[model samples]
Target: TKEDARSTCEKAARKAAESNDEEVAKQAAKDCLEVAKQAGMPTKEAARSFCEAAARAAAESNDEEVAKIAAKACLEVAKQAGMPTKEAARSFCEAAARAAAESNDEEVAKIAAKACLEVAKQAGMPTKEAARSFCEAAKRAAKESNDEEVEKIAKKACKEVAKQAGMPWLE
Candidate 1:
C-alpha cells in the first residue's frame, strides 16, 4: 500500500510536469508531495524538481501571479525537500526580477520580490539577509530601467520585508 501510494504520487507529479500550465501543475505538485509525505515516502527530489519547473515556467511566461503561486508551493516543500531557504528565495526572486525587469513591469517585480521574502521566511532563512537579497535584486531592476519610481518601490518593499524579518531598515 505504501509503495502504491508513493508510486501514485510520483506518477501524478510526473504527469503534472508534462503541462506548461503553471497554475494546475503547481497545485498538483503541492498536493502530490503532501500525499507522498503522508505516505512516509521520500519526496525531496520530486518536490524540488517540481517547484523548479513550476517557478521557471511562471518566470518564462512573465506571470507574477503564477510565479507567486509557484513560490508558495515551493515554500511548502522547501524544508521537506532539504532545500536551503535562501536558495529557494533566490530561485524565485532572481527569476521573477529578471523577467519582470525585461518586461519593465516594476509592479510585478516588487510583488515577486515580496513573495520571495515571505517564502524565505517560511524556509527559516535569516529574514534580514533575505530582505537584502530581494531588495538588491529589485533595485537592480529599477536601475536597469532608470525608473526612480521603481527604485522607490523597491526601497519601500525592502523596508517592509526587513520589518517582517524583525530588522530596522536594511543597510
Candidate 2:
C-alpha cells in the first residue's frame, strides 16, 4: 500500500516537474496532493509534497498572485500536516516578498508584504525574525528591480515590519 501510494504521488509530481509552465505546475501540485491522499498516503506527507511542488512552481514564476496562492495553500497544509507552520510562513513570505518587489506591481507588492506579515503572525513566527527576513526579501528584490517604485514599497514594508518587531521607531 505504501509503495503504491508513493509511486502514484511521485509519478504525478514528476510529470509536473517537466511542465515548462508555472501555471501547469501549480495546478498539478494541487492535483497530485489529492492523488497522494486518495492513493493512501499519509495526510501530512501529502500536504508536505504539495507544499514543495507549489513552492517550486510559484517561486519560479515571480507572480505575486501565484506567490499569494502558494503561501496560503502551504499555510493551510502546514496546519493540516502539523508541520512547522512558522517556518512555512517565514520562507514562503520571503519568496512572496521577493516576487512582489520584482513584479513591478506596486499596489500588489504592498498588499503582498502586509499579507506576508499577517501570515507570519498567524504561523507564530517571532516578530523580530519575521522583520529581519522581510527586510532581506525587500532588499534583494530592490536590487533586481533597479530602484523602481519597488524600492519605496520595500522601505515602507520595512517600516511596518520593524514596528511589528518592536523597533524604536517613535522618533
Candidate 3:
C-alpha cells in the first residue's frame, strides 16, 4: 500500500527529527526519503515537508556536523521529488547556512556554504553571476551573527564556484 508506506516514511522522518543523535538522525532521514521515493508514496510537497522538518531539527540542535549531513539529505530528497535543481540548491544553501550560523562555527558555516556552491554547479547553475549570488546569500546568512571569518570563507568559496563556471581563478 503506497499510502501505508508514505505514512510510515512520514513517521520515520518525524522521529528522526526528534532524535538528538546526529548520525542516527541523518541515517533515518536518508532512509525514509529513499524509501518514500522508491515506493512512490509521498507527493512532492509531502516529501519536501518531511525533509524540511528533519533539516530544521538538525539546524536547531547545535550540531553543525549533523546539520550539514541532514541538509545534504534534504537536497537529495528534493531532487528525488523532482524539484528543480536551482530550487533545491537554494533551499539546501539556506538551511545549511542557518544551521551553521546557529552552531556559531565559522569553519562549519564555510563548509556548508561551499556545499551549496557545489550543488548549484551540479544543478547547471555554473554562471559566474549565479556563483556570486549563491555565495553572497550563503555569506550573508552565515554572517548574520557577525562573523568576519564566515565572510572570508564565503569569498574563497565564491572563487571556487567561479572556477567551476570556467572562469580564471579569482584573486
lDDT of each: 0.58, 0.59, 0.55
Give one digit per residue, the lDDT tens place, for model 3 in 61-95.
44544544555555555665666656665655555
Indicate which candidate wins on lDDT: 2
Cα distance off (Å), candidate 1, residue 66: 4.5
Clashing residue pairs found in predicted model 3: none
Q: What ranking emerges by lDDT with the best candidate at the front?
A: 2, 1, 3
TM-score of each: 0.49, 0.52, 0.47
Candidate 2: tens digits of C-alpha lDDT, residues 1-171? 655554543444444444455555455555555666677776666655555444444545545455455556666656655668876677656755665555545555555555566557667886666667777788778878687577877776666556545774510
Model 1 residue runs over 4 Å out of place are 1-68, 76-81, 139-168
Tens digits of lDDT, candidate 1, 1-171 = 456544554454344434446565556766666776777766765555555454445545444455555666665555546656567666555544544445455455455555565556666666566667766776787788698877766666555456555677673
- TM accuracy, model 3: 0.47
Query: Of models 1 and 3, which has the larger TM-score?
Result: 1
- In terms of TM-score, the best-performing candidate is 2
RMSD list, candidates in order: 8.6, 8.3, 7.6
Q: How much is the lDDT of residue 91 in candidate 3?
A: 59
